[PDB]
Design an enzyme around this catalytic site. Sequence first.
Site: not given
Ligand SMILES: c1ccc2[nH]c(-n3ccnc3)nc2c1
Length: 273
Positions: A12, A15, A17, A32, A73, A117
């Site tokens: 992102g 920074g 994740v 993150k 998720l 955002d």
């Molecule tokens: C929590 C926070 C940010 C997250 N970004 C994902 N994500 C992005 C592409 N596939 C899964 N799961 C997350 C769960």
Amino acid sequence: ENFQKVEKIGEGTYGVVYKARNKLTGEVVALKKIPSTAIREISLLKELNHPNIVKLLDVIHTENKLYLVFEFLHQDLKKFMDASALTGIPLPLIKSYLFQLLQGLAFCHSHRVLHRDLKPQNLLINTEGAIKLADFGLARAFVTLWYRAPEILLGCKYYSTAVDIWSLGCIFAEMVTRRALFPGDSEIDQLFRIFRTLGTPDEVVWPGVTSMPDYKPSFPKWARQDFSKVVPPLDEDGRSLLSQMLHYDPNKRISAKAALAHPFFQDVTKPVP
Ligand SMILES: c1ccc2[nH]c(-n3ccnc3)nc2c1
């Protein structure tokens, strides 16, 4: 130390994740890796819980770094839209998602918290048919212009919760058409894509607009296009809602709560994706 890092999920604005596993609990989290003020603001947000907001489990300030631990998720709406590009997303599902996001925002907004955002990559989905707002409030604490409201683009400092409604309207139309509404590559191209569609705003539709910091009398003057050409073949309820979400004047823009009473959601369900 407390987390085995599984996979770089992404990167992102704030920074890295990683998908990571807690070792003392076994639980899988999104980890993150990211000022005294920023950390307080971030910690306030641990108290902000709702089923359509991705849970911030923890905030660890250590070895002078910031780690934010979120519920994980598996999918994001961006990735879901790319894979549904040739078939589209069925309308009951679009309608379910929009309704849930609006519930999410109405909760946050009633607590004077903004997202600031929103974009498809911040909207996370599960196999249950739930959609959730991720990175909520992280902007205040501490890149795509496509979802950015015009009051922000015109240099307003003191923008409101209406900026998130604008963003959600943009995402809604994109779900329906399978193409971004206002895909600008600079701030000015972003503003001018909005003007070509919705008309160049004036004092008639937006009282005070001409006195905004970056407003220029020299902006080309476009006419408003019909919304039936913008989001075909969305029905009249849907178009009525979308136009209220994309009003220029943040004060006339529908609120999240008022949108939940809209007749578009008369027959709303929860389909599984
Ligand atoms: C929590 C926070 C940010 C997250 N970004 C994902 N994500 C992005 C592409 N596939 C899964 N799961 C997350 C769960």
